[PDB]
Nucleic acid binder design. Structure first.
Lengths: 476, 419
DNA sequence: CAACCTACTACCTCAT
DNA sequence: TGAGGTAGTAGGTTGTATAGT
């Protein structure tokens, strides 16, 4: 009968120097860490997209409750929580009429259907910032509904609506992934919302019922949107509360290019996080990383140095010195030829360790009494380099679970290096709280690998880009 | 002196707001008092308010909401407030907080209708800013702002009941330990005896083709009828390896490394499972990565096993409980049993559309919780067991793999408090 | 494209 | 033909009720 260890739920700090456990609760009590004071809203959409944006931005001053407030606390109001004021009449509008939609969207082929609509926003967004001197904190995009259904792969346009044929057959494509790519050489922050989200009351089915049932969850939506919006304007709402300073977390990303003849070409990415999670992302160059025989991705000793240094030296500028500890998170185990590329560039002082976080199917843990599963924080330590961690399960403050069944832990193996495992766990847990795009109690996967695939889908959508080190708020 | 500020609130419709303001205010330098902060067992509940409103209370706050007017206690708490308002003779002693939009001018109580109100409907802050300017326009004794005192109640008032207790408890797992393996794993130099065209799943016993050999727990004399010309084989040509040397890491050679052996043993356990399964009274369900095994309707009494249901209906559809096995060798030689839900239209005939199988599994599966998953999983392996606790997996005519249905438990401390 | 988690197919794929 | 593995999709509804064989 082996026993597990409790990794105490680590805390995050807020304004006025006091820390709490839930990022939603403390925000109304204290507010964001560093506070900007003005957010001019830049709108890009139809006329209907305006009032839908106008009415909702008019409504987040008003509180909206959830169905079960005990499980997702209330929203007081923007001016009440964050201190910054967000006004409806403060709107900079660049219109893209529905008349431009039907011309550029009615194409037989999906790639030219997507690309031409992406073409329409890039000129109207870039030129709206160029000409007008108006400092727009974030530019908001109100994509109409009839585009989301029609601008992905595996969703062909009907044989009816077309108004321009494709000129050759088919012998990436997602919109918010593609639009985000051509705005990387222009460090301009964007947030994409559909009309289906803000105004779900209008768009119904045949039965007179809303297409997306938000009636129970209308309050929590004010948490997700109005938190992620404040960040891209330039203010980080919360650091992590307690940390040994001078520590680095690097998140590895590959992505196989399906369009290439070689089954090894992939666009690599390396995302670094520190205490704040604003972070920085350093793009790695393209090369053969997919080993189709063994199946796992691996790097070549050339790109690992050009990536760690281009990453680590930016830390020598972020803080005045070199890092003391660096932990490298990734999906696959590390072989030997790759690690000597890292150890060679790493300072002799700095200890370096690589960690394998896999969402595998190894164990469920059925609590022996009662209908509620085990509480988040239990962790089986099998050996001194491998351990099980329950990121999901029950949460005591919330009185509800995060997984709708018996939870599944994630498997953490220290493949390379040597380190006190219980210190990784107490740190990996703290990397769950940090997620700005949604204010939740915790994530299931640490934030270093959260947007692995969404970052990968940005780089491969445009190959000619030379993407420098950029903050994360330009990538989300 | 009189400094404590009371807040009279409508319970329980508008208790949410008081929780937002009192914590906001105590940190802003105020010594506040409200009946949300103290848990009272004392027989005298009013004796606290009637006292604390009269001598030390500096201002009275009342929530002008829908249920603010109607609640009995709220208008009766206000009685002493308008009684003391005559004592200090201040016109703005009583200040309301208007939070409801639907209330017209008519429905508001006449004691407060004409009183200088505060609009909270547009923005909760934009009223709060308009309120504490009056706190500065009249000299209210208040200490400088310190939010260190703010959440110390929050951890004591709300978060105290819902936190990590120290209760120790045990959890059951889905890892099922292996009782005992066969002694040794033997390899056979069959060369021409096994045809290049023969697939090893037909063998009726677990066999994996190796580079030159065919690995098996069964002895070389086990399958001759399925594959003839084995009778010529001699036992000394086989290279034998003890089982307990493999998982103990002791063995490693130039022609096979232990981490390669460890991959072979997993596949033999699974093929061993599938074979013994067709002896064990279950229909199979063809999934992507494995076969699922489920119980037909009525194959047990009242579709219950050990008072535990294993087969039920959803709407018209009939749902069964199923499992799918797998092997793993670290840390312990174990057998991993995953749970699945299969759907049938009449009790026997599967629903061919995969779309229904998944979309209707979560319609049911979301409804279950910790009790029903363990109850139906731990009951199903007891059904597949051969005696009491054990399972006999045939990997030879005389060499078998034995598996215990009782999964290894996990001890722990600091359990949550169950609701 | 609010977002998480957690299931499960078929597809394109390379390898043996 | 199956091996393993990885990345494409799909669907559900915001989750521990309360009447009643």
């Amino acid at each position: 009968m082996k026993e597990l260890i409790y990794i105490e739920e680590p805390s995050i700090l807020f304004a006025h120097g006091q820390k709490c456990t839930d990022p939603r609760d403390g925000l109304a009590l204290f507010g964001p860490l560093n506070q900007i004071y003005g957010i001019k809203s830049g709108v890009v959409g139809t006329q209907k997209g305006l009032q839908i944006f106008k009415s909702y931005l008019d409504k987040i001053q008003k509180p909206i409750y959830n169905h079960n407030n005990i499980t997702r606390p209330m929203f007081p109001g923007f001016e009440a929580v964050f201190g910054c004021k967000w006004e409806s009449q403060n709107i900079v509008f660049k219109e893209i009429t529905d008349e431009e939609i039907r011309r550029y969207l009615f194409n037989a082929s999906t790639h030219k259907r997507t690309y031409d609509l992406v073409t329409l926003f890039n000129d109207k967004i870039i030129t709206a910032n160029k000409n007008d001197e108006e400092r727009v904190d974030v530019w908001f995009v109100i994509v109409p509904e009839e585009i989301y259904k029609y601008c992905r792969p595996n969703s062909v346009l009907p044989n009816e609506l077309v108004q321009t044929k494709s000129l050759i057959s088919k012998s990436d494509a997602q919109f918010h992934d593609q639009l985000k790519a051509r705005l990387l050489e222009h460090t301009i922050p964007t947030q994409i919302l559909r009309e289906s989200t803000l105004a779900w009351r209008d768009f119904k089915n045949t039965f007179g019922a809303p297409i997306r049932d938000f009636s129970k969850i209308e309050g929590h939506l004010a948490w997700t949107i109005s938190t992620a919006a404040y960040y891209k304007a330039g203010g980080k709402p919360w650091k992590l509360g307690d940390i040994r300073p001078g520590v680095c977390y690097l998140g590895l990303v590959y992505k196989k290019i399906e369009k290439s003849k070689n089954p090894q070409n992939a666009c690599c990415a390396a995302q670094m996080f520190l205490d704040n999670g604003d972070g920085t992302v350093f793009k790695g160059e393209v090369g053969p990383w997919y080993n189709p025989e063994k199946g796992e991705y691996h790097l070549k000793p050339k790109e690992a140095k050009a990536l760690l240094t281009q990453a680590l030296e930016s830390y020598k500028e972020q803080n005045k010195s070199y890092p003391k500890e660096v932990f490298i998170h990734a999906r696959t185990r590390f072989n030997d030829e790759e690690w000597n590329a890292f150890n060679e560039v790493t300072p002799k002082n700095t200890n370096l360790v690589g960690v394998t976080i896999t969402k595998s199917k190894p164990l469920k843990l059925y609590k022996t009494e009662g209908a509620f599963p085990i509480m988040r924080g239990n962790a089986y330590i099998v050996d001194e380099k491998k351990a099980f961690l329950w990121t999901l399960g029950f949460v005591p403050k919330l009185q509800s679970t995060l997984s709708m069944e018996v939870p599944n832990p994630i498997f953490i193996e220290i493949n390379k290096g040597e380190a006190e495992i219980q210190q990784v766990l107490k740190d990996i847990l703290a990397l769950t709280k940090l997620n700005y795009n949604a204010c939740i109690y915790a994530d299931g996967e640490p934030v270093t690998l959260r947007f692995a695939n969404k970052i990968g889908e940005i780089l491969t959508a445009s190959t000619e880009i030379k993407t420098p080190p950029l903050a994360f708020k330009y990538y989300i | 002196m009189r400094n404590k500020i009371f807040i009279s609130h409508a319970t329980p419709e508008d208790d949410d707001f008081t929780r937002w303001l009192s914590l906001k205010l105590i940190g802003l330098g105020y010594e506040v008092w409200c009946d949300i902060l103290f848990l009272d067992k004392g027989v005298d509940f009013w004796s606290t308010i009637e006292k604390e409103i009269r001598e030390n209370t500096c201002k009275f706050l009342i929530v002008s909401s829908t249920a603010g007017n109607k609640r009995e206690g709220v208008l009766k708490e206000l009685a002493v407030a308008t009684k003391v308002k005559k004592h200090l003779q201040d016109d703005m002693f009583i200040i309301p907080l208007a939070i409801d939009e639907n209330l017209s001018y008519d429905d508001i109580n006449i004691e407060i209708v004409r009183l200088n109100a505060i609009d909270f409907k547009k923005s909760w802050a934009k009223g709060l800013q308009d309120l504490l300017d009056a706190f500065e326009k009249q000299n209210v004794p208040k200490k400088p702002p310190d939010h260190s005192k703010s959440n110390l109640l929050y951890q004591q008032i709300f978060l105290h009941d819902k936190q990590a207790i120290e209760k120790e408890e045990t959890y059951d797992s889905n890892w099922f330990p292996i009782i005992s393996f066969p002694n040794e794993l033997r390899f056979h130099r069959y060369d021409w005896r096994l045809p290049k065209q023969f697939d090893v799943r037909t063998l009726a016993f677990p066999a994996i083709r190796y580079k030159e050999y065919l690995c098996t727990f069964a002895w070389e004399y086990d399958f001759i009828h399925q594959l003839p010309k084995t009778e010529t084989y001699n036992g000394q040509e086989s290279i034998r390896i003890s089982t307990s040397d493999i998982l103990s890491g002791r063995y490693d050679t130039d022609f096979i490394r232990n981490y390669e052996c460890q991959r072979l043993i997993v596949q033999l356990i699974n093929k061993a499972f599938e074979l013994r399964m067709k002896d064990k009274n279950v229909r199979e369900y063809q999934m992507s990565k494995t076969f699922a095994y489920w119980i037909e309707k009525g194959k047990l009494e009242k579709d219950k096993f050990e008072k535990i249901k294993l087969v039920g209906k959803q709407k018209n559809k009939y749902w069964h409980f199923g499992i799918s096995a797998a092997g793993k060798l670290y840390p312990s030689p174990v057998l991993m049993v995953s749970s699945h839900i299969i759907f049938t239209m009449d009790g026997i005939n599967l629903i061919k559309s995969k779309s229904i199988q998944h979309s209707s599994r979560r319609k049911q599966g979301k409804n279950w919780w910790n009790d029903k998953w363990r109850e139906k999983l731990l009951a199903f392996i007891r059904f597949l067991s051969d005696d009491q606790n054990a399972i006999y997996l045939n990997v030879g005519s005389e060499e078998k793999i034995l598996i215990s249905n009782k999964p290894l438990k996990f001890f722990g401390k600091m359990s949550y408090v169950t609701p």
